[PDB]
């Protein structure tokens, strides 16, 4: 009449560690900043963002 | 004037293993959208079963 399928009671997720520690405190909190005409372009790469 | 009694083999298959496929498990399992998409196909699963 049917099939017997036991269902999973809950779901889990696994992922690798958040490595390389993406620098977001030096840009958002700096002692000195550039000018509106001479803004500095900062690129963040090779790191998983948080 | 002389006779020889010899025996020969002859193998014939009888029956194979009975198979029962789980239909909605094999198509796609653990999805409500799968049920909604398979219940609108009429009867393409009950006939196979």
Curated annotation (Swiss-Prot), chain B:
Substitution effect: residue 1 to I: In strain: Alpha/B.1.1.7
Residue positions the entry lists as glycosylated: 2
Lineage top rank: taxon: Viruses
Disulfide cysteine pairs (residue numbers): 23-45, 28-34
Function description: Precursor of the fusion protein processed in the biosynthesis of the S protein and the formation of virus particle. Mediates fusion of the virion and cellular membranes by functioning as a class I viral fusion protein. Contains two viral fusion peptides that are unmasked after cleavage. The S2/S2' cleavage occurs during virus entry at the cell membrane by host TMPRSS2 or during endocytosis by host CSTL.
Protein's UniProt name: Spike protein S2
Annotated source species: Severe acute respiratory syndrome coronavirus 2 (2019-nCoV)
